[PDB]
Design an enzyme around this catalytic site. Structure first.
Site, PDB file in Angstrom:
ATOM      1  N   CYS A   1     -53.963 -23.536  43.821  1.00  0.00           N
ATOM      2  CA  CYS A   1     -53.310 -22.328  43.323  1.00  0.00           C
ATOM      3  C   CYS A   1     -53.592 -22.197  41.847  1.00  0.00           C
ATOM      4  O   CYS A   1     -53.055 -22.960  41.025  1.00  0.00           O
ATOM      5  CB  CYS A   1     -51.803 -22.356  43.587  1.00  0.00           C
ATOM      6  N   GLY A   2     -54.467 -21.264  41.483  1.00  0.00           N
ATOM      7  CA  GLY A   2     -54.888 -21.134  40.101  1.00  0.00           C
ATOM      8  C   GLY A   2     -53.730 -20.823  39.166  1.00  0.00           C
ATOM      9  O   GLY A   2     -53.517 -21.499  38.159  1.00  0.00           O
ATOM     10  N   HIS A   3     -52.973 -19.794  39.506  1.00  0.00           N
ATOM     11  CA  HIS A   3     -51.907 -19.335  38.629  1.00  0.00           C
ATOM     12  C   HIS A   3     -50.811 -20.388  38.539  1.00  0.00           C
ATOM     13  O   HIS A   3     -50.209 -20.591  37.482  1.00  0.00           O
ATOM     14  CB  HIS A   3     -51.372 -17.964  39.060  1.00  0.00           C
TER      15      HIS A   3
ATOM     16  N   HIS B   1     -60.583  -9.750  49.887  1.00  0.00           N
ATOM     17  CA  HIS B   1     -60.017  -9.250  48.652  1.00  0.00           C
ATOM     18  C   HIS B   1     -60.844  -8.097  48.141  1.00  0.00           C
ATOM     19  O   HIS B   1     -62.079  -8.112  48.262  1.00  0.00           O
ATOM     20  CB  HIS B   1     -60.041 -10.299  47.524  1.00  0.00           C
TER      21      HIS B   1
ATOM     22  N   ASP C   1     -52.078  -8.933  43.200  1.00  0.00           N
ATOM     23  CA  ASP C   1     -51.879  -9.933  42.175  1.00  0.00           C
ATOM     24  C   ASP C   1     -51.344  -9.255  40.921  1.00  0.00           C
ATOM     25  O   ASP C   1     -51.877  -8.258  40.455  1.00  0.00           O
ATOM     26  CB  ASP C   1     -53.225 -10.614  41.897  1.00  0.00           C
TER      27      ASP C   1
ATOM     28  N   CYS D   1     -56.127 -12.361  38.234  1.00  0.00           N
ATOM     29  CA  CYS D   1     -56.613 -13.150  39.367  1.00  0.00           C
ATOM     30  C   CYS D   1     -57.744 -14.109  38.943  1.00  0.00           C
ATOM     31  O   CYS D   1     -58.813 -13.680  38.506  1.00  0.00           O
ATOM     32  CB  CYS D   1     -57.057 -12.247  40.519  1.00  0.00           C
ATOM     33  N   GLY D   2     -57.523 -15.415  39.069  1.00  0.00           N
ATOM     34  CA  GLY D   2     -58.501 -16.377  38.603  1.00  0.00           C
ATOM     35  C   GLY D   2     -59.795 -16.338  39.380  1.00  0.00           C
ATOM     36  O   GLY D   2     -60.879 -16.235  38.795  1.00  0.00           O
ATOM     37  N   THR D   3     -59.694 -16.450  40.694  1.00  0.00           N
ATOM     38  CA  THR D   3     -60.894 -16.361  41.521  1.00  0.00           C
ATOM     39  C   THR D   3     -61.526 -14.977  41.425  1.00  0.00           C
ATOM     40  O   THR D   3     -62.751 -14.852  41.434  1.00  0.00           O
ATOM     41  CB  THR D   3     -60.626 -16.730  42.999  1.00  0.00           C
TER      42      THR D   3
END
Lengths: 308, 308
Positions: A88-90, A208, A232, A236-238
C-alpha cells in the site's frame, strides 16, 4: 475495555489507520506468516478497526510489527474493511510519517518489510517521504477508445504497478465538485476499454483510468478511478509512476527532473525517474499529515465492539 | 498542532463524535446564539471534525457546552458534514453515555439545553438511557400505496417527531446484507407515496419509511429509510416513537408496557408510552457504547487540516 492505540493520518487525502499497540502478539517468522495469523486467528481486530462504526470504505489499516529483515526498520501488514492487502503506497508514507511523529525513527532511509517483499522509503529532514516504485513502462500510445455518450478519445496504456489508461483530452472538468460526473465517465471508459478488447500486455485487464488536465499550481492535475468504482484522493503512487513512464516515453520529462502531479483534491506528489533498459525506475515523493492520536475503545458489553 | 479532544461512540450503531475540548470559546447567552457563532465565526472546526479525512456521511458531531438553563447539566450543538442540526436523539444518548464514561455526570435525570429547546434524559444505574420523545400519534391506518415493481402494500401514517410510513407486510427480507435491496424498495415507496398524494396531516410530506418484521429476539425488527437515502443503523428514536403510537392505536401495546424494537443491524431500543389526549407520550431507552477516546490533530502545515 480493551484499548488499541492508533495513529490516523492521510497521504494527500488518502487515509491510513496505523495500529501501534493492542493487537494480539504474532509469532510467525515472516510477514506473510504473520498476515496469515491475523487473518486466521485474529480477524476480529481488523474488523473492530475497519468495519462500522469505527471505519469506512476509504480507510486502509496498517499493523505496526517488529522488523523481520536484519536491515528493516519495521514490518507492516495492510488491510481494509474487506480483508488483507499486499502493499500500500499511501499507507507506507503514512506509516513512516507516523513513526516520525512518535519519535520512533529519524530522517534517513527505512526499509519496510511487507507480506510480499520489502519497500524502501527515505524520510527527508523536512518530512517529505520518497518511495521507490516498481519498474514502469508505456505499452501502447494514443490508443483510440469510443466511450458511449462521448465518442472517441485517445489514451496511453501503461504499467506502474497496476495497469492504467491515461487520458489528456477527455473534455471533462477535473475538479472535486465534479467527481460524480468524472466517476461515471471513467467507469464507462473502463467498460469501453474491456468491450473493445483494449488491454495491457499479455491480455491483462486495464482496471484503472487516470484523466489529466493543466493546473495553475502544478505540472498536471489528475482524477484516478480504481477498482470498486473508487477514486483516489491523492495523485496515486502507481498511477503517477505510470504517468512518469509516459512522460519519459514522449520525451516530456528528462531523467532526474521533477514532475509535480496534483490530484482531484489538490494534494500533490513529486515524481522523478531514471532509466533501466526498457523500463523506468520511478521515485514518488509525498507527505502524510497526522489527523488523530486515538485510543480505540473496545467495550466487551457492546455487541458491535468488533464491528457491525 | 492544534488538538481537539473527542469521544466517539455509537447508539445502536449510529455514531456520535462528542467534542469535549479544543473548539473556540462561544460567548452567546442562548444555545441558539452559540450555534450561530459556530456557524458564522468558527465553521472550520465542524469541517475539521466532519469532512474527509476525519469524518464521513453517517457521523453526527456534538459540541459539549456549559449549561445555559439553571436546571441543565450541559448544552449541546449538533452538526454533520453539511451544516448544523437542531436536535439529535441518538447523539443525545451518545452525549450522556460519554459524560458518564468521563466521570462528569452520575446516574439520574439530566436536562440538556439544545438550540431548539431542552431534552430530558435519565441515565440509569446500569448505563441505559431513557429519553422523553415528542408527543406522537397515528394519522391514518392501513393506507394503500402502489409501489412500482411490487404492487399495493398498506401502511400507517404516523408522527413521532418526523412523518413516517410504517409497513408490516412488504415481502422483503429485513437483514443487513439485504440493505441495498431494502434501500431501493423504500426509496421507491417514498416516491410512490408522493406521487399518489399520500401525506401527513396538513399535507406534510412523508420523508421516512419504516419496514417491520418478526424477530426471534425482539418484538419486531425494522429498516428505517431517511432523507438523503440514508438508513438508520439504530431502531430510530422518532421512528420507534411513531411505532409506539401505532401500537397504541391498534391496542397491541398497553400504557406502561415495554416494546423491544430491533434495528437492521440488530441493535435494540425499549419503548413505552403513556396517554396524553389524542397523543401519546413516548419514552425511548437505549444504550451508547464508547468507540474511541481521541485527540484529533490539526497540523497547521496540512492543506487538509480543516477538511477536504
Amino acid at each position: 475495555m480493551k484499548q488499541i492505540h492508533v495513529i490516523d493520518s492521510h497521504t494527500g487525502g488518502e487515509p491510513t489507520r496505523l495500529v501501534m499497540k493492542g493487537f494480539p502478539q504474532l509469532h510467525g517468522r515472516s510477514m506473510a506468516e504473520q498476515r496469515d495469523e491475523l487473518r486466521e486467528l485474529h480477524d476480529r481486530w481488523r474488523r473492530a478497526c475497519l468495519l462500522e462504526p469505527r471505519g469506512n470504505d476509504v480507510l486502509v489499516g496498517a499493523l505496526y510489527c517488529p522488523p523481520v529483515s536484519a536491515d528493516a526498520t519495521c514490518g507492516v501488514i495492510f488491510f481494509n474493511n474487506a480483508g488483507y492487502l499486499n502493499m500500500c503506497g499511501h499507507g507506507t508514507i503514512g506509516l513512516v510519517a507516523s513513526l516520525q511523529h512518535l519519535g520512533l525513527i529519524a530522517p534517513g532511509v527505512h526499509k519496510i518489510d511487507t507480506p510480499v517483499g520489502q519497500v524502501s522509503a527515505t524520510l527527508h529532514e523536512d518530512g517529505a517521504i520518497t518511495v521507490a516504485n516498481v519498474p514502469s513502462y508505456r505499452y501502447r500510445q494514443h490508443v483510440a477508445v469510443n466511450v458511449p455518450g462521448h465518442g472517441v478519445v485517445h489514451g496511453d496504456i501503461a504499467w506502474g504497478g497496476n495497469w492504467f489508461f491515461l487520458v489528456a483530452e477527455h473534455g471533462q472538468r477535473i475538479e472535486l465538485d465534479n467527481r460524480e460526473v468524472l466517476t461515471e465517465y471513467t467507469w464507462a471508459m473502463l467498460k469501453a476499454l474491456e468491450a473493445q478488447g483494449i488491454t495491457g500486455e499479455n491480455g491483462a485487464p486495464i482496471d484503472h483510468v487516470e484523466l489529466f488536465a493543466d493546473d495553475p499550481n502544478a505540472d498536471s492535475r489528475n482524477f484516478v478511478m480504481c477498482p470498486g468504482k473508487a477514486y483516489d484522493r491523492s495523485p496515486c503512487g502507481t498511477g503517477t509512476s505510470a504517468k512518469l513512464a509516459c512522460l519519459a516515453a514522449d520525451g516530456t520529462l528528462a531523467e532526474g527532473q521533477t514532475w509535480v502531479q496534483a490530484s482531484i483534491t489538490g494534494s500533490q506528489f513529486h515524481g522523478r525517474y531514471e532509466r533501466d533498459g526498457e523500463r523506468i525506475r520511478p521515485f514518488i515523493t509525498g507527505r502524510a499529515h497526522m489527523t488523530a492520536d486515538s485510543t480505540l475503545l473496545i467495550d466487551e458489553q457492546d455487541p458491535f465492539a468488533w464491528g457491525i
